[PDB]
Amino acid sequence: CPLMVKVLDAVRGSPAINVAMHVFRKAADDTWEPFASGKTSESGELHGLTTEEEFVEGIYKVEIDTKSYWKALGISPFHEHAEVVFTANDSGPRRYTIAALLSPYSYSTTAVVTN
Amino acid sequence: CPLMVKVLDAVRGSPAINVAMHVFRKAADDTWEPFASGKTSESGELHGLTTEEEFVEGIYKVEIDTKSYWKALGISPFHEHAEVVFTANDSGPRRYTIAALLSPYSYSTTAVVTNP
Amino acid sequence: CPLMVKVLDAVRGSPAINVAMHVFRKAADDTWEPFASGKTSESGELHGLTTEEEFVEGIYKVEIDTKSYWKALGISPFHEHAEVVFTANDSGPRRYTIAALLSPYSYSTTAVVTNP
Amino acid sequence: CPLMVKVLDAVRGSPAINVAMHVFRKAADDTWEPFASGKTSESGELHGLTTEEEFVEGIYKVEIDTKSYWKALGISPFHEHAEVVFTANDSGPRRYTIAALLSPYSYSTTAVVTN
Numbered sequence: 001c002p003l004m005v006k007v008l009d010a011v012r013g014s015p016a017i018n019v020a021m022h023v024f025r026k027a028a029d030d031t032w033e034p035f036a037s038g039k040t041s042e043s044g045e046l047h048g049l050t051t052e053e054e055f056v057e058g059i060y061k062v063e064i065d066t067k068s069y070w071k072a073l074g075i076s077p078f079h080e081h082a083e084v085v086f087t088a089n090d091s092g093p094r095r096y097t098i099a100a101l102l103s104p105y106s107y108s109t110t111a112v113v114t115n
Numbered sequence: 116c117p118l119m120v121k122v123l124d125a126v127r128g129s130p131a132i133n134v135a136m137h138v139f140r141k142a143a144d145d146t147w148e149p150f151a152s153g154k155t156s157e158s159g160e161l162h163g164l165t166t167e168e169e170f171v172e173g174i175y176k177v178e179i180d181t182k183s184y185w186k187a188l189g190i191s192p193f194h195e196h197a198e199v200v201f202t203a204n205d206s207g208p209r210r211y212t213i214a215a216l217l218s219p220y221s222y223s224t225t226a227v228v229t230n231p
Numbered sequence: 232c233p234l235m236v237k238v239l240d241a242v243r244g245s246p247a248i249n250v251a252m253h254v255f256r257k258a259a260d261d262t263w264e265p266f267a268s269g270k271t272s273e274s275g276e277l278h279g280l281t282t283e284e285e286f287v288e289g290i291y292k293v294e295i296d297t298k299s300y301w302k303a304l305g306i307s308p309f310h311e312h313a314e315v316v317f318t319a320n321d322s323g324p325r326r327y328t329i330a331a332l333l334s335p336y337s338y339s340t341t342a343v344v345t346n347p
Numbered sequence: 348c349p350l351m352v353k354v355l356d357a358v359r360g361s362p363a364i365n366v367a368m369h370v371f372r373k374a375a376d377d378t379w380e381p382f383a384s385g386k387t388s389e390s391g392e393l394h395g396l397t398t399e400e401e402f403v404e405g406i407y408k409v410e411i412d413t414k415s416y417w418k419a420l421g422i423s424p425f426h427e428h429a430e431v432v433f434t435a436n437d438s439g440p441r442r443y444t445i446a447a448l449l450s451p452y453s454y455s456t457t458a459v460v461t462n
Protein backbone atom coordinates (compact mmCIF):
# COMPACT_ATOMS: atom_id res chain seq x y z
CA CYS A 1 0.00 0.00 0.00
CA PRO A 2 1.96 3.04 -1.29
CA LEU A 3 -0.73 5.59 -0.38
CA MET A 4 -3.18 5.65 2.54
CA VAL A 5 -5.42 8.45 3.82
CA LYS A 6 -6.63 8.69 7.41
CA VAL A 7 -9.29 11.19 8.50
CA LEU A 8 -10.22 12.10 12.10
CA ASP A 9 -13.02 14.22 13.58
CA ALA A 10 -11.88 16.79 16.19
CA VAL A 11 -15.43 17.60 17.36
CA ARG A 12 -16.48 14.04 18.15
CA GLY A 13 -13.06 12.47 18.90
CA SER A 14 -13.56 9.71 16.36
CA PRO A 15 -12.51 8.48 12.97
CA ALA A 16 -14.33 10.42 10.27
CA ILE A 17 -16.30 7.63 8.56
CA ASN A 18 -17.71 7.57 4.99
CA VAL A 19 -15.73 10.64 3.94
CA ALA A 20 -15.39 10.72 0.14
CA MET A 21 -12.21 11.81 -1.57
CA HIS A 22 -10.69 11.86 -5.03
CA VAL A 23 -7.01 11.59 -5.96
CA PHE A 24 -5.69 13.38 -9.07
CA ARG A 25 -2.34 13.39 -10.89
CA LYS A 26 -1.08 16.55 -12.59
CA ALA A 27 -1.04 16.11 -16.38
CA ALA A 28 1.44 17.58 -18.90
CA ASP A 29 -1.11 20.32 -19.79
CA ASP A 30 -1.16 21.44 -16.10
CA THR A 31 -4.64 19.94 -15.57
CA TRP A 32 -5.76 17.44 -12.93
CA GLU A 33 -6.39 13.91 -14.19
CA PRO A 34 -8.59 11.88 -11.83
CA PHE A 35 -7.24 8.43 -11.10
CA ALA A 36 -8.37 7.06 -7.75
CA SER A 37 -11.13 7.61 -5.22
CA GLY A 38 -12.99 6.07 -2.31
CA LYS A 39 -14.58 6.78 1.04
CA THR A 40 -13.13 6.25 4.50
CA SER A 41 -13.83 3.05 6.44
CA GLU A 42 -15.17 2.68 10.00
CA SER A 43 -11.60 3.35 11.15
CA GLY A 44 -11.46 6.56 9.07
CA GLU A 45 -8.96 5.03 6.65
CA LEU A 46 -8.83 4.64 2.93
CA HIS A 47 -6.47 1.98 1.55
CA GLY A 48 -5.91 0.41 -1.87
CA LEU A 49 -5.95 3.67 -3.84
CA THR A 50 -2.96 2.69 -6.03
CA THR A 51 -0.12 0.17 -6.58
CA GLU A 52 3.66 0.53 -6.50
CA GLU A 53 3.89 0.31 -10.33
CA GLU A 54 1.19 2.91 -10.98
CA PHE A 55 2.28 5.37 -8.31
CA VAL A 56 5.13 6.97 -10.24
CA GLU A 57 6.81 10.32 -9.53
CA GLY A 58 4.59 13.32 -10.13
CA ILE A 59 2.39 15.87 -8.43
CA TYR A 60 -0.71 14.46 -6.76
CA LYS A 61 -3.79 16.09 -5.26
CA VAL A 62 -6.12 14.49 -2.71
CA GLU A 63 -9.46 16.32 -2.55
CA ILE A 64 -11.32 15.38 0.63
CA ASP A 65 -15.09 16.19 0.70
CA THR A 66 -15.17 17.59 4.20
CA LYS A 67 -18.19 19.77 3.40
CA SER A 68 -20.50 16.75 2.83
CA TYR A 69 -19.18 15.21 6.06
CA TRP A 70 -20.12 18.22 8.21
CA LYS A 71 -23.43 18.58 6.32
CA ALA A 72 -24.37 14.99 7.20
CA LEU A 73 -23.76 15.87 10.87
CA GLY A 74 -25.86 19.08 10.71
CA ILE A 75 -22.90 21.41 11.27
CA SER A 76 -22.20 24.36 8.93
CA PRO A 77 -18.60 24.12 7.75
CA PHE A 78 -16.20 26.74 6.44
CA HIS A 79 -14.26 24.86 3.76
CA GLU A 80 -15.58 23.50 0.47
CA HIS A 81 -13.10 20.65 0.82
CA ALA A 82 -9.64 19.93 2.19
CA GLU A 83 -6.94 19.62 -0.48
CA VAL A 84 -3.55 17.99 -0.11
CA VAL A 85 -1.15 18.60 -3.01
CA PHE A 86 2.31 16.99 -2.96
CA THR A 87 5.14 15.69 -5.13
CA ALA A 88 5.50 11.95 -4.81
CA ASN A 89 8.51 9.67 -4.82
CA ASP A 90 11.09 12.36 -5.52
CA SER A 91 13.80 10.00 -4.21
CA GLY A 92 12.13 6.69 -5.13
CA PRO A 93 9.03 4.77 -3.84
CA ARG A 94 8.02 5.63 -0.27
CA ARG A 95 4.90 4.64 1.65
CA TYR A 96 2.73 7.73 2.22
CA THR A 97 0.16 8.18 4.92
CA ILE A 98 -1.79 11.41 4.62
CA ALA A 99 -3.65 12.27 7.81
CA ALA A 100 -6.30 14.95 8.09
CA LEU A 101 -7.85 16.21 11.32
CA LEU A 102 -11.16 17.99 10.80
CA SER A 103 -13.07 20.75 12.56
CA PRO A 104 -15.93 22.84 11.14
CA TYR A 105 -13.72 25.93 10.65
CA SER A 106 -10.30 24.32 10.56
CA TYR A 107 -8.35 21.39 9.23
CA SER A 108 -4.82 20.14 9.70
CA THR A 109 -2.96 17.74 7.48
CA THR A 110 0.27 15.85 7.99
CA ALA A 111 2.26 13.33 5.95
CA VAL A 112 4.07 10.36 7.41
CA VAL A 113 6.50 9.10 4.78
CA THR A 114 8.21 5.81 5.64
CA ASN A 115 9.85 2.62 4.33
CA CYS B 116 -10.22 44.51 5.20
CA PRO B 117 -12.86 41.88 4.37
CA LEU B 118 -10.07 39.34 3.69
CA MET B 119 -6.78 38.97 5.57
CA VAL B 120 -4.30 36.06 5.65
CA LYS B 121 -1.89 35.39 8.55
CA VAL B 122 0.87 32.76 8.24
CA LEU B 123 3.07 31.44 11.05
CA ASP B 124 6.14 29.19 11.00
CA ALA B 125 6.04 26.34 13.57
CA VAL B 126 9.77 25.43 13.11
CA ARG B 127 11.16 28.87 13.88
CA GLY B 128 8.40 30.25 16.17
CA SER B 129 7.94 33.33 14.00
CA PRO B 130 5.68 34.88 11.44
CA ALA B 131 6.18 33.38 7.99
CA ILE B 132 7.51 36.40 6.07
CA ASN B 133 7.41 37.00 2.29
CA VAL B 134 5.09 34.08 1.64
CA ALA B 135 3.44 34.43 -1.76
CA MET B 136 -0.21 33.62 -2.31
CA HIS B 137 -2.80 33.91 -5.03
CA VAL B 138 -6.54 34.23 -4.51
CA PHE B 139 -9.01 32.90 -7.12
CA ARG B 140 -12.79 33.13 -7.47
CA LYS B 141 -14.97 30.57 -9.17
CA ALA B 142 -16.56 31.91 -12.36
CA ALA B 143 -20.03 31.11 -13.75
CA ASP B 144 -18.40 28.55 -16.12
CA ASP B 145 -16.74 26.73 -13.15
CA THR B 146 -13.19 27.94 -13.89
CA TRP B 147 -10.91 29.63 -11.31
CA GLU B 148 -10.46 33.28 -12.20
CA PRO B 149 -7.57 35.27 -10.68
CA PHE B 150 -8.90 37.58 -7.94
CA ALA B 151 -5.94 39.03 -5.97
CA SER B 152 -2.39 38.21 -4.91
CA GLY B 153 0.33 39.35 -2.59
CA LYS B 154 3.04 38.36 -0.12
CA THR B 155 3.08 38.34 3.68
CA SER B 156 4.69 41.25 5.54
CA GLU B 157 7.24 41.07 8.35
CA SER B 158 4.32 40.30 10.70
CA GLY B 159 3.33 37.34 8.48
CA GLU B 160 0.15 39.13 7.40
CA LEU B 161 -1.32 40.03 4.06
CA HIS B 162 -3.87 42.87 4.07
CA GLY B 163 -5.61 44.88 1.32
CA LEU B 164 -6.43 41.99 -1.01
CA THR B 165 -9.94 43.26 -1.75
CA THR B 166 -12.76 45.65 -0.82
CA GLU B 167 -16.23 45.09 0.57
CA GLU B 168 -17.79 46.04 -2.79
CA GLU B 169 -15.51 43.80 -4.89
CA PHE B 170 -15.73 40.86 -2.45
CA VAL B 171 -19.12 39.58 -3.57
CA GLU B 172 -20.70 36.16 -2.80
CA GLY B 173 -18.88 33.24 -4.36
CA ILE B 174 -16.40 30.39 -3.94
CA TYR B 175 -12.84 31.60 -3.31
CA LYS B 176 -9.52 29.73 -3.27
CA VAL B 177 -6.41 30.98 -1.50
CA GLU B 178 -3.29 29.12 -2.71
CA ILE B 179 -0.39 29.78 -0.34
CA ASP B 180 3.05 29.06 -1.81
CA THR B 181 4.44 27.16 1.16
CA LYS B 182 6.92 25.14 -0.91
CA SER B 183 8.94 28.22 -2.04
CA TYR B 184 8.93 29.42 1.58
CA TRP B 185 10.54 26.22 2.91
CA LYS B 186 12.91 25.85 -0.09
CA ALA B 187 14.29 29.33 0.61
CA LEU B 188 15.11 28.14 4.17
CA GLY B 189 16.92 25.06 2.82
CA ILE B 190 14.03 22.68 3.50
CA SER B 191 12.35 20.31 1.01
CA PRO B 192 8.77 20.20 2.25
CA PHE B 193 5.98 17.71 1.61
CA HIS B 194 3.28 19.99 0.19
CA GLU B 195 3.30 21.96 -3.08
CA HIS B 196 1.13 24.64 -1.48
CA ALA B 197 -1.56 25.09 1.18
CA GLU B 198 -5.02 25.52 -0.32
CA VAL B 199 -8.02 27.11 1.39
CA VAL B 200 -11.35 26.92 -0.53
CA PHE B 201 -14.49 28.46 0.91
CA THR B 202 -17.83 30.04 0.08
CA ALA B 203 -17.80 33.67 1.19
CA ASN B 204 -20.58 36.18 1.98
CA ASP B 205 -23.39 33.70 1.43
CA SER B 206 -25.47 35.27 4.21
CA GLY B 207 -24.38 38.87 3.70
CA PRO B 208 -20.94 40.52 4.09
CA ARG B 209 -18.48 39.04 6.56
CA ARG B 210 -14.83 39.72 7.46
CA TYR B 211 -12.54 36.71 6.97
CA THR B 212 -9.19 36.02 8.55
CA ILE B 213 -7.54 32.92 7.17
CA ALA B 214 -4.77 31.64 9.43
CA ALA B 215 -2.17 29.02 8.53
CA LEU B 216 0.49 27.38 10.70
CA LEU B 217 3.31 25.77 8.68
CA SER B 218 5.70 22.86 9.23
CA PRO B 219 7.67 21.08 6.56
CA TYR B 220 5.42 17.98 6.57
CA SER B 221 2.22 19.47 7.96
CA TYR B 222 0.03 22.50 7.92
CA SER B 223 -3.06 23.63 9.75
CA THR B 224 -5.49 26.27 8.70
CA THR B 225 -8.40 27.91 10.44
CA ALA B 226 -10.80 30.72 9.71
CA VAL B 227 -12.09 33.57 11.85
CA VAL B 228 -15.33 34.88 10.41
CA THR B 229 -16.84 38.01 11.91
CA ASN B 230 -19.98 39.99 11.22
CA PRO B 231 -18.91 43.50 10.13
CA CYS C 232 3.53 43.16 26.48
CA PRO C 233 6.24 40.52 26.92
CA LEU C 234 3.53 37.83 27.22
CA MET C 235 0.26 37.64 25.30
CA VAL C 236 -2.14 34.69 24.79
CA LYS C 237 -4.53 34.38 21.81
CA VAL C 238 -7.21 31.65 21.74
CA LEU C 239 -9.38 30.68 18.76
CA ASP C 240 -12.38 28.37 18.47
CA ALA C 241 -12.20 25.92 15.52
CA VAL C 242 -15.90 24.85 15.83
CA ARG C 243 -17.40 28.32 15.57
CA GLY C 244 -14.68 30.10 13.51
CA SER C 245 -14.31 32.84 16.10
CA PRO C 246 -12.09 34.07 18.86
CA ALA C 247 -12.54 32.07 22.06
CA ILE C 248 -13.96 34.73 24.40
CA ASN C 249 -13.87 34.79 28.22
CA VAL C 250 -11.46 31.87 28.45
CA ALA C 251 -9.81 31.77 31.87
CA MET C 252 -6.14 31.01 32.31
CA HIS C 253 -3.55 30.98 35.04
CA VAL C 254 0.18 31.48 34.58
CA PHE C 255 2.69 29.86 36.98
CA ARG C 256 6.46 30.15 37.37
CA LYS C 257 8.72 27.44 38.68
CA ALA C 258 10.28 28.35 42.04
CA ALA C 259 13.77 27.45 43.30
CA ASP C 260 12.23 24.53 45.26
CA ASP C 261 10.61 23.11 42.06
CA THR C 262 7.03 24.10 42.96
CA TRP C 263 4.70 26.07 40.65
CA GLU C 264 4.14 29.54 42.06
CA PRO C 265 1.19 31.64 40.84
CA PHE C 266 2.45 34.36 38.47
CA ALA C 267 -0.57 35.99 36.72
CA SER C 268 -4.09 35.23 35.54
CA GLY C 269 -6.85 36.61 33.41
CA LYS C 270 -9.54 35.91 30.82
CA THR C 271 -9.58 36.44 27.06
CA SER C 272 -11.28 39.54 25.64
CA GLU C 273 -13.83 39.69 22.81
CA SER C 274 -10.90 39.36 20.38
CA GLY C 275 -9.81 36.14 22.16
CA GLU C 276 -6.68 37.85 23.49
CA LEU C 277 -5.23 38.30 26.93
CA HIS C 278 -2.77 41.18 27.34
CA GLY C 279 -1.08 42.83 30.36
CA LEU C 280 -0.17 39.66 32.24
CA THR C 281 3.30 40.91 33.17
CA THR C 282 6.04 43.49 32.61
CA GLU C 283 9.52 43.24 31.15
CA GLU C 284 11.06 43.74 34.62
CA GLU C 285 8.86 41.16 36.37
CA PHE C 286 9.16 38.61 33.52
CA VAL C 287 12.58 37.29 34.46
CA GLU C 288 14.27 34.06 33.20
CA GLY C 289 12.54 30.89 34.31
CA ILE C 290 10.14 28.06 33.48
CA TYR C 291 6.55 29.24 33.02
CA LYS C 292 3.29 27.30 32.71
CA VAL C 293 0.14 28.70 31.13
CA GLU C 294 -2.92 26.59 32.05
CA ILE C 295 -5.84 27.50 29.80
CA ASP C 296 -9.26 26.47 31.14
CA THR C 297 -10.60 24.98 27.92
CA LYS C 298 -13.01 22.61 29.67
CA SER C 299 -15.12 25.43 31.23
CA TYR C 300 -15.15 27.14 27.82
CA TRP C 301 -16.67 24.12 26.04
CA LYS C 302 -19.02 23.25 28.95
CA ALA C 303 -20.51 26.74 28.76
CA LEU C 304 -21.29 26.07 25.06
CA GLY C 305 -23.02 22.76 25.95
CA ILE C 306 -20.06 20.60 24.94
CA SER C 307 -18.30 17.95 27.05
CA PRO C 308 -14.71 18.13 25.82
CA PHE C 309 -11.86 15.65 26.10
CA HIS C 310 -9.22 17.79 27.84
CA GLU C 311 -9.29 19.25 31.36
CA HIS C 312 -7.21 22.20 30.18
CA ALA C 313 -4.54 23.12 27.62
CA GLU C 314 -1.09 23.42 29.17
CA VAL C 315 1.86 25.34 27.71
CA VAL C 316 5.19 24.97 29.59
CA PHE C 317 8.29 26.80 28.40
CA THR C 318 11.58 28.34 29.45
CA ALA C 319 11.44 32.09 28.88
CA ASN C 320 14.14 34.77 28.47
CA ASP C 321 17.02 32.32 28.67
CA SER C 322 19.05 34.34 26.14
CA GLY C 323 17.85 37.79 27.17
CA PRO C 324 14.36 39.38 27.01
CA ARG C 325 11.94 38.21 24.35
CA ARG C 326 8.28 38.90 23.55
CA TYR C 327 6.08 35.77 23.59
CA THR C 328 2.75 35.23 21.93
CA ILE C 329 1.19 31.91 22.84
CA ALA C 330 -1.55 30.88 20.41
CA ALA C 331 -4.06 28.08 20.91
CA LEU C 332 -6.68 26.71 18.52
CA LEU C 333 -9.45 24.73 20.28
CA SER C 334 -11.75 21.86 19.31
CA PRO C 335 -13.66 19.65 21.69
CA TYR C 336 -11.32 16.66 21.23
CA SER C 337 -8.16 18.42 20.08
CA TYR C 338 -6.07 21.48 20.56
CA SER C 339 -3.01 22.96 18.92
CA THR C 340 -0.66 25.49 20.35
CA THR C 341 2.20 27.45 18.87
CA ALA C 342 4.51 30.20 20.01
CA VAL C 343 5.71 33.37 18.31
CA VAL C 344 8.92 34.55 19.93
CA THR C 345 10.32 37.91 18.90
CA ASN C 346 13.40 39.86 19.89
CA PRO C 347 12.23 43.15 21.47
CA CYS D 348 -5.34 -1.92 25.13
CA PRO D 349 -7.39 0.84 26.85
CA LEU D 350 -4.78 3.58 26.32
CA MET D 351 -2.34 4.13 23.45
CA VAL D 352 -0.18 7.16 22.59
CA LYS D 353 1.01 7.95 19.08
CA VAL D 354 3.59 10.67 18.37
CA LEU D 355 4.49 12.12 14.94
CA ASP D 356 7.21 14.51 13.79
CA ALA D 357 5.99 17.40 11.58
CA VAL D 358 9.51 18.48 10.55
CA ARG D 359 10.67 15.10 9.25
CA GLY D 360 7.30 13.55 8.28
CA SER D 361 7.88 10.47 10.38
CA PRO D 362 6.88 8.73 13.56
CA ALA D 363 8.65 10.31 16.52
CA ILE D 364 10.70 7.36 17.81
CA ASN D 365 12.12 6.83 21.34
CA VAL D 366 10.05 9.65 22.81
CA ALA D 367 9.72 9.17 26.58
CA MET D 368 6.51 9.90 28.43
CA HIS D 369 5.00 9.40 31.86
CA VAL D 370 1.33 8.90 32.73
CA PHE D 371 -0.03 10.17 36.06
CA ARG D 372 -3.38 9.82 37.86
CA LYS D 373 -4.73 12.65 39.99
CA ALA D 374 -4.75 11.67 43.68
CA ALA D 375 -7.26 12.68 46.38
CA ASP D 376 -4.80 15.34 47.66
CA ASP D 377 -4.79 16.98 44.18
CA THR D 378 -1.26 15.69 43.44
CA TRP D 379 -0.08 13.62 40.47
CA GLU D 380 0.66 9.98 41.21
CA PRO D 381 2.91 8.37 38.58
CA PHE D 382 1.67 5.03 37.35
CA ALA D 383 2.83 4.19 33.85
CA SER D 384 5.57 5.18 31.42
CA GLY D 385 7.47 4.15 28.32
CA LYS D 386 9.02 5.38 25.12
CA THR D 387 7.58 5.31 21.62
CA SER D 388 8.38 2.45 19.24
CA GLU D 389 9.73 2.64 15.66
CA SER D 390 6.13 3.37 14.61
CA GLY D 391 5.90 6.23 17.13
CA GLU D 392 3.45 4.29 19.30
CA LEU D 393 3.34 3.37 22.93
CA HIS D 394 1.07 0.46 23.90
CA GLY D 395 0.56 -1.61 27.05
CA LEU D 396 0.50 1.33 29.48
CA THR D 397 -2.45 -0.04 31.49
CA THR D 398 -5.22 -2.70 31.66
CA GLU D 399 -9.00 -2.44 31.63
CA GLU D 400 -9.22 -3.23 35.39
CA GLU D 401 -6.59 -0.67 36.42
CA PHE D 402 -7.76 2.12 34.13
CA VAL D 403 -10.66 3.33 36.27
CA GLU D 404 -12.44 6.70 36.05
CA GLY D 405 -10.31 9.65 37.08
CA ILE D 406 -8.19 12.48 35.78
CA TYR D 407 -5.05 11.43 33.93
CA LYS D 408 -2.02 13.35 32.68
CA VAL D 409 0.35 12.20 29.93
CA GLU D 410 3.63 14.14 30.04
CA ILE D 411 5.52 13.73 26.77
CA ASP D 412 9.25 14.65 26.83
CA THR D 413 9.28 16.54 23.56
CA LYS D 414 12.24 18.68 24.68
CA SER D 415 14.64 15.68 24.81
CA TYR D 416 13.36 14.58 21.39
CA TRP D 417 14.20 17.90 19.70
CA LYS D 418 17.51 18.08 21.63
CA ALA D 419 18.56 14.69 20.24
CA LEU D 420 17.91 16.08 16.74
CA GLY D 421 19.92 19.29 17.36
CA ILE D 422 16.88 21.58 17.14
CA SER D 423 16.09 24.13 19.88
CA PRO D 424 12.51 23.62 21.01
CA PHE D 425 10.04 25.95 22.68
CA HIS D 426 8.15 23.64 25.06
CA GLU D 427 9.52 21.86 28.12
CA HIS D 428 7.13 19.02 27.35
CA ALA D 429 3.69 18.40 25.88
CA GLU D 430 1.01 17.63 28.47
CA VAL D 431 -2.33 15.97 27.86
CA VAL D 432 -4.74 16.07 30.82
CA PHE D 433 -8.15 14.38 30.52
CA THR D 434 -10.94 12.70 32.48
CA ALA D 435 -11.19 9.03 31.62
CA ASN D 436 -14.13 6.69 31.28
CA ASP D 437 -16.79 9.18 32.36
CA SER D 438 -19.43 6.95 30.71
CA GLY D 439 -17.66 3.59 31.15
CA PRO D 440 -14.50 1.97 29.60
CA ARG D 441 -13.52 3.37 26.20
CA ARG D 442 -10.39 2.77 24.16
CA TYR D 443 -8.31 5.96 24.06
CA THR D 444 -5.76 6.88 21.45
CA ILE D 445 -3.90 10.09 22.22
CA ALA D 446 -2.08 11.47 19.20
CA ALA D 447 0.49 14.23 19.32
CA LEU D 448 1.99 16.00 16.31
CA LEU D 449 5.25 17.78 17.09
CA SER D 450 7.08 20.82 15.75
CA PRO D 451 9.87 22.76 17.47
CA TYR D 452 7.57 25.69 18.39
CA SER D 453 4.20 23.98 18.24
CA TYR D 454 2.34 20.83 19.13
CA SER D 455 -1.15 19.55 18.47
CA THR D 456 -2.93 16.80 20.31
CA THR D 457 -6.10 14.91 19.53
CA ALA D 458 -8.01 12.07 21.18
CA VAL D 459 -9.73 9.28 19.30
CA VAL D 460 -12.12 7.58 21.71
CA THR D 461 -13.74 4.40 20.38
CA ASN D 462 -15.27 1.01 21.20
Ligand SMILES: C[C@@H](Cc1ccc(O)c(O)c1)[C@@H](C)Cc1ccc(O)c(O)c1
Nearest residue numbers: 097099101108109110112446448455457
Ligand atom coordinates in the same frame (compact mmCIF):
# COMPACT_ATOMS: atom_id res chain seq x y z
C1 LIG E 1 -3.97 9.53 14.73
C2 LIG E 1 -2.92 10.31 13.93
C3 LIG E 1 -2.89 9.83 12.48
C4 LIG E 1 -2.37 8.56 12.23
C5 LIG E 1 -3.02 7.40 12.65
C6 LIG E 1 -2.49 6.14 12.34
C7 LIG E 1 -1.32 6.07 11.59
O1 LIG E 1 -0.73 4.90 11.24
C8 LIG E 1 -0.69 7.23 11.16
O2 LIG E 1 0.45 7.08 10.45
C9 LIG E 1 -1.21 8.47 11.47
C10 LIG E 1 -3.30 11.80 13.84
C11 LIG E 1 -4.24 12.19 14.98
C12 LIG E 1 -2.03 12.65 13.88
C13 LIG E 1 -2.30 14.01 13.73
C14 LIG E 1 -2.33 14.81 14.87
C15 LIG E 1 -2.60 16.17 14.75
C16 LIG E 1 -2.83 16.73 13.51
O3 LIG E 1 -3.08 18.06 13.38
C17 LIG E 1 -2.79 15.95 12.35
O4 LIG E 1 -3.03 16.56 11.14
C18 LIG E 1 -2.53 14.58 12.47
Ligand SMILES: C[C@@H](Cc1ccc(O)c(O)c1)[C@@H](C)Cc1ccc(O)c(O)c1
Nearest residue numbers: 212214216223225330331332339340341
Ligand atom coordinates in the same frame (compact mmCIF):
# COMPACT_ATOMS: atom_id res chain seq x y z
C1 LIG F 1 -4.73 33.08 14.18
C2 LIG F 1 -3.22 32.95 14.30
C3 LIG F 1 -2.76 33.84 15.47
C4 LIG F 1 -3.15 35.17 15.21
C5 LIG F 1 -2.30 36.24 15.49
C6 LIG F 1 -2.67 37.56 15.23
C7 LIG F 1 -3.92 37.80 14.67
O1 LIG F 1 -4.37 39.05 14.37
C8 LIG F 1 -4.77 36.74 14.38
O2 LIG F 1 -5.97 37.06 13.84
C9 LIG F 1 -4.40 35.42 14.64
C10 LIG F 1 -2.80 31.47 14.47
C11 LIG F 1 -1.71 31.35 15.52
C12 LIG F 1 -3.97 30.57 14.91
C13 LIG F 1 -3.64 29.20 14.84
C14 LIG F 1 -3.87 28.51 13.65
C15 LIG F 1 -3.57 27.15 13.55
C16 LIG F 1 -3.04 26.48 14.65
O3 LIG F 1 -2.74 25.15 14.60
C17 LIG F 1 -2.81 27.17 15.84
O4 LIG F 1 -2.28 26.46 16.89
C18 LIG F 1 -3.11 28.53 15.94
